[PDB]
Structure formats: structure tokens, C-alpha cells
Amino acid sequence: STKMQTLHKLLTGEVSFKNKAPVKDCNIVHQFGENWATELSAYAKTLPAEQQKIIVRQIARVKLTRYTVAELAAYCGDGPALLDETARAANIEQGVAFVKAKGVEAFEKYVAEESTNANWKPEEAKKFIEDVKAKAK
Amino acid sequence: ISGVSPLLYFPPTTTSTTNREDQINKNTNIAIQMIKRYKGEVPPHYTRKSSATIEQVEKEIDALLGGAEKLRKTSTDDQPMDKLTLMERCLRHALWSYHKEEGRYDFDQIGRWVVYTPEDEVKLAQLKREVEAKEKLAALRKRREEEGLPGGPVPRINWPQEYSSFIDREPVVAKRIRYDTLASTTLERDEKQIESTLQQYRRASQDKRLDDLVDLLERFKPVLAREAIMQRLTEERRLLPVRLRSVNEVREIMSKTQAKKSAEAAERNP
Amino acid sequence: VIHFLQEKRAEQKLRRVLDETYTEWTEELDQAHVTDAITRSLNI
Amino acid sequence: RADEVDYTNLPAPKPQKTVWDDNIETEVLRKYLDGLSQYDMEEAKYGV
Amino acid sequence: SKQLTFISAGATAAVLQSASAIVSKVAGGRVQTKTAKEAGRHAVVVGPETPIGVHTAVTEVPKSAQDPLFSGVSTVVVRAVLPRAAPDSVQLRDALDVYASAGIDTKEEVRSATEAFKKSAEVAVGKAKAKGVKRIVLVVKQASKHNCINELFKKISTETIESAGLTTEVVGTAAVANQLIVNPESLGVVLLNDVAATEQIELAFAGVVGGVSRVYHTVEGGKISAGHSFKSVALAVAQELRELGLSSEADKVEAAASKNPRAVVSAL
């Protein structure tokens, strides 16, 4: 009960972190857990409609907050709903350029290293590499 | 780095074609602009009274000293000097003060004829260290360019450690962007244009110094003529103590004058 | 004795000529600031 | 049933000063590299 | 007969071509569309980069184009823009901080920066008074490098605002960016000092809201529209056409931008 209340207050902005650190998706995932969104959505159902709408809106905004400011500026120009696809296309184009620049095997190793650093599932990395290879030809 | 990031960080290379020549030209224009602002305004043009190349002046000094060397007796530093030694020092000091500005750094003669005060010794040490460092840096950058390594400096970092350390990726990605852009650019300036601008700035002073050196040589020649004439043949309280100064006293007097000039320069700015 | 006084006067002139001379070290804009300006211009 | 955790507490991001290899190109640019390191540490502390 | 001036600043050729096609298809040829690098009126600037001749960089949240996520929000983000020199020359925002370190005199640059900051602060206080807010939020990057431009920015903006009678709350860049993206209803008017990070923050806010057109106030006196993506450029062109005195065409462009962001030209 306390965890959900604290999360609701934090997202609503009533209570900030100890050091007034920004309320980003990364920090929330670090503290509350990987699946904070699901538990928060389940808990919100026990609240009036206004609080439910506020919770949904705040969750959406926090999810938008998962990108750096530069990425949002470059890719979110034409709306937030189209942000994910534009970012994915830009990343795929960068991958294609890297492949055409410095081969494939080195590209495979680099993608593996970045997936290790970027906290990506092996399935997602494999899908990304296959997609970029298919886009090449 | 908790939280699945949405994008993989490929190198920031998007300017696939960025010719090194254009980057060096921009780095030269910026350097010229900053140097012009720092120096101020070009000094007013100065017209030499007598046109005589520095080479001819050096030849004349060498010839005069070689001819008059007969009277060259060595003495201790704390000993009164001879007219010949005084003339030699007064001429070579101007000659080497000119050569140092002109850019011909010869740290063997400059350390003997131009350095008199400890401040001068410190300045000479700094100048020599800077010149050697610039030479080494230029050679190392040329070798690096031949090999093909990135022109700019690269820090000793292990980004797999940094990703783990920081919680949020944004500062780490920003740092990677900054350092990759730094290592993808050549912080090299075209020293020909810089030296040309500096030369244009230090033209009135050099010509004035050369004219002063010519005048000094023409004024010293009669004294040697009189000394040779006397050699071939063979109120007063003010002129009794007069004597040529010992080298150490010359060093101290030069230190006093230099400190006075430094104080005046410092007071000028406020 | 006028010769002696004239000789002392000539030596005094030479001594004054030597004393007035002083090495003059110039200061030039450190290139580190130029490098910093170049870095800033890159938007880094 | 005592206190469990202060969910509003975040371990501050421990910064690390970037270290440059010791060459002539570092001694010549010592001041500039030190400035870059200071800027990096300030960015790490404040956030961007 | 008439003229719309297109300024290109770091925009991909696709965006410029789309803007030209949109204007040609909507206007019908009555108003011509010339390209240049500077203007004072009837001008649309395309691309993230800041054009030459603009001193203020205001952006709002238009009611019509509000994204469902940001419905009802009302916060004005004004970025102060210092005069822009040629790309090769050292920009004022960097000269004002590097010359002081190098010891060079910084009188004329300080004067120009003071004039620019006074104009931007006047714009910000006008907006705040119009909206009715009582306090404005200054945004300064807290890096040690920018320890002189931001100091002058504060010293002048707070001076002018207090002379006008409002209160100022200074803040860094990360906190204000996060607050603006997550909880923007708690900020009424936010001024931004001139730094690259502040430009990126302004672009991020203008995009996250759903894509809007940023207004630039120039030295000559006037307003020129600005966009960086297809929807933002379409909205900027719609606003420009409205300013020229075309209502139905502006409404059509706005509706097309709302419906089909990336392919407005074919949509309308």
C-alpha cells in the first residue's frame, strides 16, 4: 500500500526524490522495479476516475521521458505517437551506415557489445541485426 | 543503467564527408581573429631611415669584433669590464633580441647574450620548453596522421564500466557524443598564416630595433677609432668615481630597470 | 688634465649606453584558449 | 513490521574524473583537458 | 505578387521540398515563395539551427494542435537568442565566456549581450503579464564553462523582471527539462539562457506537445514562424498564411497537419 501511494505522489509531483533528482523512467525502474507500470495500473483501478486518468497520463509522460532530450528534439518533431517508429528508423539507418562503413562481422560484435551495455534482450538484438541486414539488401 | 534503453548508441558520425582542410581553415580563421583581438590594433607603419639587411649588420658586428679582439682580456664576473667587452655585449644583446623576435631561436647564444636577470632565465626556460613541446607535438601529430589514428586526443576511458556506474544513460551518452566528436576533429592550425599575422604585427618594433642597432654600431665605431689612435701613439669629484660596471652590477641594474618597466605596465592597465 | 676628464666622460657615456639596455620579453596569447574556442565552435 | 525502505532515496551517481594518457599532446593541452574533465564532472553531478 | 521567405538552417532537403510543395499547392500561385538566409517578416525558417537575425525564440502550446496527452497545458517557453555571426566567426555566446578567460576586452560583446537579454526579458514579462502568472522561471545551464554568460543573463533578466514587478526563480537545465516533459502544468513562463542545451530543450518541448511552430522575434521588429519536422513546418506555414490574410487556406493546412503528419502535402 505504501509503495503505490508513494509512486502516485511522486508521479503527481507532490513528493520528489531525496536529492530532487529528475523523475525519469530510469530512476523509477531502479527504485520501484522493472514492472512498476503494471502494478501501478492495477492499483489505480481502486481509485476514482480523475485519479485513474491522471495516473494514465503520468505513465504515458514518463514513458516519453525514456529518451534523452536530443533524441526527443530530433525524432519527436511530428508528435509523440510517431516518436517510436521514427527513432527506430533512425537507429536502423545508423546501423546500415555502420555496416556499409566497416563490414558485418565487426558490426555483429559491436551490436552485441552495445546490447550488453544497453540492457537489451538477446531476442531484440537479434531482431534488430536481422532487420538492418535485410534493409541493406 | 537500469531500464531497457530504446536505441543503441552508434558513433555520432553523420557528417560523413568533412575535409580536414576545411576544418584547419576554420581553426586558422578563428585563431587569427582571436590573436587580432588580443594584440589590439596593427601598430602604425614605420619607415626605416637606412635600409640595411640584418645579415649585413651581423657581418659588420662580427668583422668589428674580430678586428678589435686584440684588446679582449678575460676577467671575473665581479670585475670591471673593458670597453671592448662593453661594446660586444651592447651590440650582441640588440642583435639577439632582434633574432629572438624574428623567430630564429638559438638557445645557446640567446642564453649567453640576452639573459642577465633571473626573470630572464625563467622566461628563457619557459620559451625553450614551449618550443620543444611544440616541435614534439607537431612531429607526433604528423606520425599519427601517417598511421591513420584520430587527430584529436582520446581519453583513457572504458565505457562498459561507465554504463554500469551511472544509473541514467543520458549523461553517459552525452559524454560519448562529446568525446567522439572531439576525436573526429583535427585541432590543428595552419602556422603559416598565424606566423604571417604575427610578423605583420611585429614589424614596426623590429624595424625600429634594427635602426637603433645601426645607429649604435655607427656610434661605437668612433670610440674604437679613438682607442686605436691612442694605442698607436703610445668638478673632478664627479668624474673620479666613474668606472665601467661589473657584470653582476649590470645584472642588478637590468633587474631594477625591468622591474620598473613591469610596474609601469601593470599600472597602465587600471 | 682635461684629457683625463674627457676620458672619464667618454667612459661615462659608454656606461650609460650599456645601462639603458634591457631585454624585453613579450607575451603572446596562449594557444589553449584558441583550442577552447575551436572546441566551443564545434558545439561540443 | 518495521521500516522497509525509503523509496524516495536515490544513490547519487558516483562521478569519475576522465584520465587522459600522458603524452606530449596532453602536456601541451593540459589546461584544456582539465577543463573538459571539470565540465564532464559538473554535467555528471547536475545531470546534463 | 506577394512573397514568403524560406530560410534553411540545418534542415534536410526533404523538409524544404515538402514545405515548398505545400505552399505551392495551397496558395495556388497567388503568393510567391522565395528562398533566402535572413528576413524580418513573412518568413518561415526550417531546421533545428537558429537563423541569423532573430533575438527571441518564443514557443507556446496552441489550443488547436494540442496532443491528447498534453491537453489543457499552458506554459510559454521563451529562449533568449543572442545575435548570430557567420558560421566561421566565434559566436557571441562563446566569445563572452572565452575572451574573459583569455584576458581580452569584453565591453562591446557585453553591451550586445545586455541588449539582447533586455529584449528577451521584455518579451517574457509581456507574455507573463498577458497570461496572468506572477513568477517566471529562469533556466541556466550550471556547467562551470558557462560561468559568465549565465551570470550576466541572471543579472540582467532578474533586474528587468523585478523592475517590472514580477519574481524570478532560477533553475538548472536537467530539472527544468524533466519537469517540462513530465509535469509541465507547474510552469507558467520559463525563460531559457542561450546555450545549445537550451535549444535542444526548446525543440524537445515543441515536439513532445505534438508538433508546434516556434515564433521568432527579430531585430527589425516582427514575427517569423519556425518549424523542424513535417507537422511543425506545416503548422508554421499555416500560421504564416494566416498572417498574410488567408483564413480558409490556413485552416485547411492545420487540419491536414492534424490528420496526416508526415504526408500533409498529399493529404490536403
**Residues B65 and B221: beta-carbon distance below 8 Å:** no
Residue A137, exposed/middle/buried by CB under 10 A (0-12, 13-18, 19+)? exposed
Experimental method: cryo-EM
Element (H, E) at A55: helix A49-64
Domain interval for residue B209: 50-117+198-233+243-259
Provide the resolution (angstroms). Answer: 3.7
d(CA A131, CA A122): 14
3-state secondary structure of B68: helix
Paired residues of E78 in beta bridges: E58, E191
> CA torsion sign, A91 to A96 to A97 to A98?
positive
Q: Where are the alpha helices (DSSP H) in chain E?
A: 13-27, 92-102, 107-131, 149-164, 174-182, 196-208, 230-244, 247-259, 264-267
Q: How far apart are the two ends of chain D, measured CA to CA in Å? A: 40
CA dihedral B91, B93, B96, B100 (to 10 degrees): -150
d(CA A36, CA A38): 6
d(CA E170, CA E137): 6
Residue B116, exposed/middle/buried by CB under 10 A (0-12, 13-18, 19+)? buried
**Residues B57 and B91: beta-carbon distance below 8 Å:** no
Q: How many domains does chain B have?
A: 1
Please indicate whether chains C and A are in contact, defined as at least 3 beta carbon pairs under 8 Å.
no
**Residues C23 and B116: beta-carbon distance below 8 Å:** yes
Cβ–Cβ gap E178/A61 under 8 Å = no
**Residues E50 and E83: beta-carbon distance below 8 Å:** no
Residue E49, exposed/middle/buried by CB under 10 A (0-12, 13-18, 19+)? middle
Cβ–Cβ gap E89/B34 under 8 Å = no
Residue among E105, E99, E92 at smallest CA distance from E153: E92
Written as nine digits, the cell of E111 is 553591451
Specify the length of chain E in residues: 268
Alpha-carbon distances, residue E104 vs B55, B197, E206 (angstroms): 37, 18, 38
d(CA A98, CA A122): 20
Q: Is A24 on the interface with D (CB under 8 A)?
A: no
Q: Where are the alpha helices (DSSP H) in E135-195?
A: 149-164, 174-182
Q: How many Cβ atoms from other residues are within 10 Å of residue B61's Cβ?
A: 20
The gap from C-alpha B109 to its chain's centroid, in whole angstroms, comes to 15
d(CA B28, CA C38): 9
Written as nine digits, the cell of B180 is 567522439
3-state secondary structure of E78: strand
d(CA E105, CA B38): 8
Cβ–Cβ gap D20/B167 under 8 Å = no
Long-range pairs for E243-250 at CB < 8 Å and ≥24 separation? E243/E42, E244/E2, E244/E4, E244/E31, E244/E42, E246/E27, E249/E26, E249/E27
Residue B80 lies in a domain: yes
> CA torsion sign, E244 to E250 to E251 to E257?
negative
Q: Which residue has the cell 582542410?
A: B21
Q: Which residue has the cell 656606461?
A: C15
Q: Which residues of B touch C33 (CB under 8 A)?
A: 34
Q: Which residue has the cell 525519469?
A: A24
Q: Which of residues 1-44 of C touch E (CB under 8 A)?
A: 29-30, 33, 36-37, 40-41, 43
Paired residues of E170 in beta bridges: E138
d(CA A59, CA B147): 52
3-state secondary structure of E172: coil
Specify the length of chain A in residues: 137
Residue B113, exposed/middle/buried by CB under 10 A (0-12, 13-18, 19+)? buried
DSSP string, B109-131: THHHHS--SHHHHHHHHHHHHHH
Classify residue E70 by its DSSP letter: G
d(CA E10, CA E47): 5
The gap from C-alpha E134 to its chain's centroid, in whole angstroms, comes to 22
The phi-psi region of residue B114 (left if phi > 0; otherwise alpha if psi is between -120 and 50; otherwise beta) is alpha
d(CA A98, CA B7): 15
**Residues A98 and A110: beta-carbon distance below 8 Å:** yes
Measured N-to-C along each axis, helices B83-102 and B204-233 cross at an angle, to the nearest 10 degrees, of 160
Cβ–Cβ gap B34/E102 under 8 Å = yes
3-state secondary structure of C25: coil
3-state secondary structure of B201: helix
Q: Which of residues 5-44 of C touch D (CB under 8 A)?
A: 32, 35-36, 39
Q: Is D42 on the interface with B (CB under 8 A)?
A: no
CA triple E162-E167-E173, angle to 5 deg = 115
CA triple A24-A25-A28, angle to 5 deg = 90
3-state secondary structure of B104: coil
Domain ranges of chain D: 15-48
SS3 content of chain B, % helix, strand, coil (to 5): 65, 0, 30
- Which residue, among D10, D43, D45, D48, would best test binding to A if mutated, counting the most A CBs under 10 Å from its CB? D10
- Residue E164 CB partners (closer than 8 Å, separation 6+): E125, E129
Cβ–Cβ gap E89/B38 under 8 Å = no
d(CA E155, CA E149): 10
Cβ–Cβ gap A26/B11 under 8 Å = no
- Residue E186 CB partners (closer than 8 Å, separation 6+): A13, E179
Long-range pairs for B74-81 at CB < 8 Å and ≥24 separation? B77/B246, B77/B247, B77/B248, B78/B246, B78/B247, B78/B248, B79/B246, B79/B247, B80/B243, B80/B244, B80/B245, B80/B246, B81/B244, B81/B245, B81/B246, B81/B247
Residue B147 lies in a domain: no
Cβ–Cβ gap B10/A128 under 8 Å = no
Which amino acid does the sequence have at B165? S
d(CA B22, CA B18): 7
Residue B76 lies in a domain: yes
Paired residues of E192 in beta bridges: E79, E139
Burial C3-41 (b: 16+ CB within 10 A, else e): eeeeebebbeebbebbbebbbebeeebebbbbbbbbbbb
Alpha-carbon distances, residue E175 vs A20, C14, E48, E182, E208 (angstroms): 8, 73, 22, 10, 17
